[PDB]
Amino acid sequence: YRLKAYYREGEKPSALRRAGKLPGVMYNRHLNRKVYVDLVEFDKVFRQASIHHVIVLELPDGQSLPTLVRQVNLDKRRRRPEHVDFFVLSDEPVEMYVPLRFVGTPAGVRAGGVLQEIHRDILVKVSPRNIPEFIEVDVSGLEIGDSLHASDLKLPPGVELAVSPEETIAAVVPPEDVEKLAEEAAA
Amino acid sequence: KFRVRNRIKRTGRLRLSVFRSLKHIYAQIIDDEKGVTLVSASSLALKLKGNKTEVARQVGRALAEKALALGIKQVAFDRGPYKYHGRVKALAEGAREG
Amino acid sequence: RMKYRKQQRGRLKGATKGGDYVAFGDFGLVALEPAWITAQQIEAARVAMVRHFRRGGKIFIRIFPDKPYTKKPLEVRMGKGKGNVEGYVAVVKPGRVMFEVAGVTEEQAMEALRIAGHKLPIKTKIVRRDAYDE
Amino acid sequence: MPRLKVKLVKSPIGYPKDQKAALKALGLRRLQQERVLEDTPAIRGNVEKVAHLVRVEVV
Amino acid sequence: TKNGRDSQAKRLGVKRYEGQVVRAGNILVRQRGTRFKPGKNVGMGRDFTLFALVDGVVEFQDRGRLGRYVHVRPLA
RNA sequence: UAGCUGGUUCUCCCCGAAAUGACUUUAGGGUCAGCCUCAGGCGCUGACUGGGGCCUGUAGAGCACUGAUAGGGCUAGGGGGCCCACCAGCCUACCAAACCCUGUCAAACUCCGAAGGGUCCCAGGUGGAGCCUGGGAGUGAGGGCGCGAGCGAUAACGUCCGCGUCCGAGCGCGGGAACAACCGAGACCGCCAGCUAAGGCCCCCAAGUCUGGGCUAAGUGGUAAAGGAUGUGGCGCCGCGAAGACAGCCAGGAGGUUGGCUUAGAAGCAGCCAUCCUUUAAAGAGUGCGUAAUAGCUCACUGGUCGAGUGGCGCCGCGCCGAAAAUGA
RNA sequence: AGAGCGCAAGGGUAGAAGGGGGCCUGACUGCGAGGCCUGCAAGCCGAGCAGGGGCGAAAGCCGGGCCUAGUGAACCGGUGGU
RNA sequence: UCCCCCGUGCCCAUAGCGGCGUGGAACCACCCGUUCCCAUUCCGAACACGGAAGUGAAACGCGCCAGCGCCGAUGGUACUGGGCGGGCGACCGCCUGGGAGAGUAGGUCGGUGCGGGGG
Ligand SMILES: [Mg+2]
Ligand SMILES: [Mg+2]
Ligand SMILES: [Mg+2]
Ligand SMILES: [Mg+2]
Ligand SMILES: [Mg+2]
Ligand SMILES: [Mg+2]
Ligand SMILES: [Mg+2]
Ligand SMILES: [Mg+2]
Ligand SMILES: [Mg+2]
Ligand SMILES: [Mg+2]
Ligand SMILES: [Mg+2]
Ligand SMILES: [Mg+2]
Ligand SMILES: [Mg+2]
Ligand SMILES: [Mg+2]
Ligand SMILES: [Mg+2]
Ligand SMILES: [Mg+2]
Ligand SMILES: [Mg+2]
Ligand SMILES: [Mg+2]
Ligand SMILES: [Mg+2]
Ligand SMILES: [Mg+2]
Ligand SMILES: [Mg+2]
Ligand SMILES: [Mg+2]
Ligand SMILES: [Mg+2]
Ligand SMILES: [Mg+2]
Ligand SMILES: [Mg+2]
Ligand SMILES: [Mg+2]
Ligand SMILES: [Mg+2]
Ligand SMILES: [Mg+2]
Ligand SMILES: [Mg+2]
Ligand SMILES: [Mg+2]
Ligand SMILES: [Mg+2]
Ligand SMILES: [Mg+2]
Ligand SMILES: [Mg+2]
Ligand SMILES: [Mg+2]
Ligand SMILES: [Mg+2]
Ligand SMILES: [Mg+2]
Ligand SMILES: [Mg+2]
Ligand SMILES: [Mg+2]
Ligand SMILES: [Mg+2]
Ligand SMILES: [Mg+2]
Ligand SMILES: [Mg+2]
Ligand SMILES: [Mg+2]
Ligand SMILES: [Mg+2]
Ligand SMILES: [Mg+2]
Ligand SMILES: [Mg+2]
Ligand SMILES: [Mg+2]
Ligand SMILES: [Mg+2]
Ligand SMILES: [Mg+2]
Ligand SMILES: [Mg+2]
Ligand SMILES: [Mg+2]
Ligand SMILES: [Mg+2]
Ligand SMILES: [Mg+2]
Ligand SMILES: [Mg+2]
Ligand SMILES: [Mg+2]
Ligand SMILES: [Mg+2]
Ligand SMILES: [Mg+2]
Ligand SMILES: [Mg+2]
Ligand SMILES: [Mg+2]
Ligand SMILES: [Mg+2]
Ligand SMILES: [Mg+2]
Ligand SMILES: [Mg+2]
Ligand SMILES: [Mg+2]
Ligand SMILES: [Mg+2]
Ligand SMILES: [Mg+2]
Ligand SMILES: [Mg+2]
Ligand SMILES: [Mg+2]
Ligand SMILES: [Mg+2]
Ligand SMILES: [Mg+2]
Ligand SMILES: [Mg+2]
Ligand SMILES: [Mg+2]
Ligand SMILES: [Mg+2]
Ligand SMILES: [Mg+2]
Ligand SMILES: [Mg+2]
Ligand SMILES: [Mg+2]
Ligand SMILES: [Mg+2]
Ligand SMILES: [Mg+2]
Ligand SMILES: [Mg+2]
Ligand SMILES: [Mg+2]
Ligand SMILES: [Mg+2]
Ligand SMILES: [Mg+2]
Ligand SMILES: [Mg+2]
Ligand SMILES: [Mg+2]
Ligand SMILES: [Mg+2]
Ligand SMILES: [Mg+2]
Ligand SMILES: [Mg+2]
Ligand SMILES: [Mg+2]
Ligand SMILES: [Mg+2]
Ligand SMILES: [Mg+2]
Ligand SMILES: [Mg+2]
Ligand SMILES: [Mg+2]
Ligand SMILES: [Mg+2]
Ligand SMILES: [Mg+2]
Ligand SMILES: [Mg+2]
Ligand SMILES: [Mg+2]
Ligand SMILES: [Mg+2]
Ligand SMILES: [Mg+2]
Ligand SMILES: [Mg+2]
Ligand SMILES: [Mg+2]
Ligand SMILES: [Mg+2]
Ligand SMILES: [Mg+2]
Ligand SMILES: [Mg+2]
Ligand SMILES: [Mg+2]
Ligand SMILES: [Mg+2]
Ligand SMILES: [Mg+2]
Ligand SMILES: [Mg+2]
Ligand SMILES: [Mg+2]
Ligand SMILES: [Mg+2]
Ligand SMILES: [Mg+2]
Ligand SMILES: [Mg+2]
Ligand SMILES: [Mg+2]
Ligand SMILES: [Mg+2]
Ligand SMILES: [Mg+2]
Ligand SMILES: [Mg+2]
Ligand SMILES: [Mg+2]
Ligand SMILES: [Mg+2]
Ligand SMILES: [Mg+2]
Ligand SMILES: [Mg+2]
């Protein structure tokens, strides 16, 4: 994804925001400078880009840049973005969360139940070349009481995990129900 | 276990540090508050013989020579990790010969 | 539970930490006004929720009453309230996420949460899991 | 730096004691009163804190 | 209601801050324990009170893992 | 006798409090301190301010300690079931110690930590500043308001502290309809002179029926909430459209099917569980009504006609309902 | 260092204030610069000087106890001593 | 001025935990022995004396690695001296000066002072 960025400086961050400009900061091992972007345009990008897909930033200098999103501070009350972090990549390995697709339906979901997705994505060390638009997991052998750890995953080539292997990815849990209530309130 | 040093440092000045080895015995006159040594009668660095308890009493006077020649007297004895008795007591007993 | 005894009232200042993001489930109900939420409130909402979609998905509750709410018994002015008549409440600054739902259609969770709102004193908002994460 | 010309425009009645002692420090007695003072970090230090009471100009 | 109780305020803490000139013998710091260690030209009493040992100037030294210290740099 | 109540007589001039602390058979009284005043003495120090040093654990945040806490994971212990007894094995949509992940709470928790405040040094600061010794006091029921906490009910013209402030003693003046403490402002005296402050400039009433651009149709404004609605104007987003939509009107709207199961009956239509195809342009194992169970009506969808826009959702401004009281509005 | 530090809590603390051992009685007399705290009266800390001592080779440390509670003006009377 | 080692300070984890490697000429340590000084609530483990042989295994010394630990910006925000503005309030908004914690990027397996022995 691409997005037109602009340089920032003395301008009051609050004043910017009144206009429509969400301030932010691109930086990395060697680089660092204040910037900003048009908020409305940012939203349209981030609604799919998030912290997973890469984002090329175009400065007025025409400079393309393979940035990522490292964090977006939010304003409590009317959940909304304050300011953006842009991690500019080079070619060396860089940690980042990658999406996950829990394809298939366990016996749990069929026999009444619900798949809780503990991690909607996973943190893995990888080169900017390897930007797998997603990993997959055959969640189907799962059932109420069962669980999947990172100790087993559709790890593509070159993509090694940085999170602990024993971290749980997801699990199927029993459903909340009405006939439980009569039993519950008894205690 | 260097409680001994802490206790001495609090007092006057001129700490007579007395490190000693399996076949060695050294001694410095350190005026702290600056971390500098003024005198240093080494043994296995001087040349002395071999008898240790007899050797230490000698190296003790080696300080006395170099000490007074500068103007020193605070006998503040840094009996290090070693208990005052053997080649230390002798090194001391000897130092106190002057 | 445990803690100890009864506790001062304090004040519900700005919703500084009174804000949040969804961390479980697809949909959520966030507060918009500061308030002490009672146990009787939290519960009544939670039950009325499942009660709505029987044998449905799974609900999460991220606010929890740890504050003892005191109350003198129809008299004058001695000592601290025997209190606890309303027992325990949870501090809620405007912006904090309270209830998560999961494993149900949008119209199935747009109602469940719509209701839980009513059982609450404050005005509240429903939310999709936007896309804001960490 | 060039001298400072300050003038009292809002009454101190109902303002903290320190703000009273400030005007007395600068030498502002009654209202609308003129007062020109060699500007130093010490003189401006009071003018600063009484800014909501006075209108200043450079001379 | 058994509760209306407390004990006298002991007015402890640092009694002479850094740079302040001091006469020999006068007090520098009263404290619960050794929230401040003595050091050069500063003695300590039964209650952990730190008192200057000679006319001079007070100065504080922090030494990390070894704690804070109060010193009187003499002059006369 | 009265630590109580009352009463205390001419004039002008200068300054001007307190309603707090400690102790008190003390609590509406006293002693000392605090604050007022007079006299003599010292003389740039005083409030406030600039620069610098040191002291600090609040706001905020945090979970590293002390505890609290939702979900999940891993996993002792215990519980149920298979199986049994020599005790052993496995299962465990039961409860759960420790541990870990995610997510959090705390006046008496803190890995952290402001703003600020305190103090000393240097400098500005001659002010009804300051300091030393004395003579004389009064005060020791405060009150409201802002801010920070406790108590209370996140009640009270409530109560108790803290920093301010005003009334007290400025019920003198202007504004606020009227009104100690809200806004403006510190009244030595005189003036049929001027500029302003708060607030105001249609009439009572001084001063614009001023200028320019919007919004509001309720008398809103002229003082009320959860919550409810095709109020009205405004920005944004998604989708349908001249390859013919939205609305209305002409026609079909089905077959196996009467879905499996519950049930006296459950024929798309009490509930439970749910994921076929086909005549075809289209009709969902079904939106609502109608039934005892059905047939009947309709949408959904497709065809025609028409001929230009239409439908949903998020955001902001002002407004509508919610809205019942006792002498006349 | 989450233990211990006689006893509530807090601060402090193993570079000991904690556990053990040898000798020991400074749980001394005569004082006390300068302070903390403070309305009064009280309370608290204290270097050093003199006497005669205890432990240490010595530098040194000792005027009770890791610290903050364990308390009572004056009057009146008891006992000992100059 | 340079290098190795010994002793001792200074700051007080970027100095630490751990994994790999290297050093015995010198220095250091383990190491031989327990007659003498000295020592064990038992024991030469410790303390101590007298000391060749062997060793660098242990300990320590130096150097590498970033798994733990530790350090950690910039940007923005919470909060807030001071000054104001809106609502019944529980509250909220602007100007001015100060400005976190968490988190992101990164950093670190140290830097140095005096004496002494040694090329
Ligand atoms: Mg639950
Ligand atoms: Mg009563
Ligand atoms: Mg009772
Ligand atoms: Mg005035
Ligand atoms: Mg005013
Ligand atoms: Mg001040
Ligand atoms: Mg009390
Ligand atoms: Mg009290
Ligand atoms: Mg400390
Ligand atoms: Mg002492
Ligand atoms: Mg006068
Ligand atoms: Mg006057
Ligand atoms: Mg008292
Ligand atoms: Mg009386
Ligand atoms: Mg008096
Ligand atoms: Mg002056
Ligand atoms: Mg701190
Ligand atoms: Mg807080
Ligand atoms: Mg940690
Ligand atoms: Mg704990
Ligand atoms: Mg405990
Ligand atoms: Mg398991
Ligand atoms: Mg078991
Ligand atoms: Mg068994
Ligand atoms: Mg068994
Ligand atoms: Mg088993
Ligand atoms: Mg706190
Ligand atoms: Mg505490
Ligand atoms: Mg701050
Ligand atoms: Mg200050
Ligand atoms: Mg200062
Ligand atoms: Mg003059
Ligand atoms: Mg005066
Ligand atoms: Mg005066
Ligand atoms: Mg003076
Ligand atoms: Mg007087
Ligand atoms: Mg009086
Ligand atoms: Mg009284
Ligand atoms: Mg009163
Ligand atoms: Mg007041
Ligand atoms: Mg208010
Ligand atoms: Mg206000
Ligand atoms: Mg009360
Ligand atoms: Mg409150
Ligand atoms: Mg009130
Ligand atoms: Mg009065
Ligand atoms: Mg006044
Ligand atoms: Mg009146
Ligand atoms: Mg008036
Ligand atoms: Mg009128
Ligand atoms: Mg009034
Ligand atoms: Mg009036
Ligand atoms: Mg008035
Ligand atoms: Mg005003
Ligand atoms: Mg008017
Ligand atoms: Mg209303
Ligand atoms: Mg209202
Ligand atoms: Mg209204
Ligand atoms: Mg409303
Ligand atoms: Mg309606
Ligand atoms: Mg469409
Ligand atoms: Mg065309
Ligand atoms: Mg229509
Ligand atoms: Mg028609
Ligand atoms: Mg038809
Ligand atoms: Mg028809
Ligand atoms: Mg048909
Ligand atoms: Mg049809
Ligand atoms: Mg029909
Ligand atoms: Mg069908
Ligand atoms: Mg039919
Ligand atoms: Mg019919
Ligand atoms: Mg809206
Ligand atoms: Mg709106
Ligand atoms: Mg309204
Ligand atoms: Mg009506
Ligand atoms: Mg009437
Ligand atoms: Mg601990
Ligand atoms: Mg402890
Ligand atoms: Mg203990
Ligand atoms: Mg103890
Ligand atoms: Mg403690
Ligand atoms: Mg230490
Ligand atoms: Mg002991
Ligand atoms: Mg001991
Ligand atoms: Mg003993
Ligand atoms: Mg003296
Ligand atoms: Mg004295
Ligand atoms: Mg006194
Ligand atoms: Mg008195
Ligand atoms: Mg002494
Ligand atoms: Mg003597
Ligand atoms: Mg002493
Ligand atoms: Mg003891
Ligand atoms: Mg002791
Ligand atoms: Mg002891
Ligand atoms: Mg204390
Ligand atoms: Mg008497
Ligand atoms: Mg050379
Ligand atoms: Mg290995
Ligand atoms: Mg050997
Ligand atoms: Mg023998
Ligand atoms: Mg011998
Ligand atoms: Mg002997
Ligand atoms: Mg030997
Ligand atoms: Mg080896
Ligand atoms: Mg090792
Ligand atoms: Mg290498
Ligand atoms: Mg690292
Ligand atoms: Mg890491
Ligand atoms: Mg910053
Ligand atoms: Mg209001
Ligand atoms: Mg409010
Ligand atoms: Mg700043
Ligand atoms: Mg930070
Ligand atoms: Mg390291
Ligand atoms: Mg270095």
Closest by CA position to A40, among listed A3, A88, A66, A78: A3
Chain C nearest C-alpha distance from E7 (Å): 20
Four-point Cα dihedral A99, A105, A108, A112, nearest 10: 110
C-alpha span between B75 and B73 (Å, rounded): 6
Chain C nearest C-alpha distance from E65 (Å): 34
Is A172 in contact with A151 (CB distance < 8 Å)?
no
Is D37 in contact with D22 (CB distance < 8 Å)?
no
E2 contact C CB<8A:
no
Closest by CA position to C57, among listed C111, C95, C97: C111
C-alpha span between A107 and A113 (Å, rounded): 9
C-alpha span between A106 and A100 (Å, rounded): 16
Q: Which residues have beta carbons under 5 A from ligand 44 (an ion)? A: C 11
- Chain F nucleotides near the protein (CB, 7 A): 46-56, 59-62, 67-74, 92-94, 101-108, 118-121, 123-129, 148-154, 164-166, 183-186, 226-227, 236-237, 272-274
Q: Helix axis angle, D17-26 relative to D41-49, nearest 10°?
A: 140
Rounded to the nearest 5 degrees, what angle is found at the Cα of A132, between the Cα atoms of A128 and A137?
A: 145
Q: Which residues are registered as beta bridge partners of A148?
A: A170
C-alpha span between A7 and A63 (Å, rounded): 12
C-alpha span between A77 and C92 (Å, rounded): 12
Question: Residues, chain E, total?
Answer: 76
E4 contact C CB<8A:
no
C-alpha span between A164 and C73 (Å, rounded): 55
From first CA to last CA, the distance across chain C in angstroms is: 32
Paired sense of beta strands A147-149 and B15-17, if any? unpaired
C-alpha span between A149 and A141 (Å, rounded): 13
Residue written as tokens 């090194």? B91
CA distances from A129 to A93, A94, A136, A155, C31 (A): 9, 11, 19, 15, 43
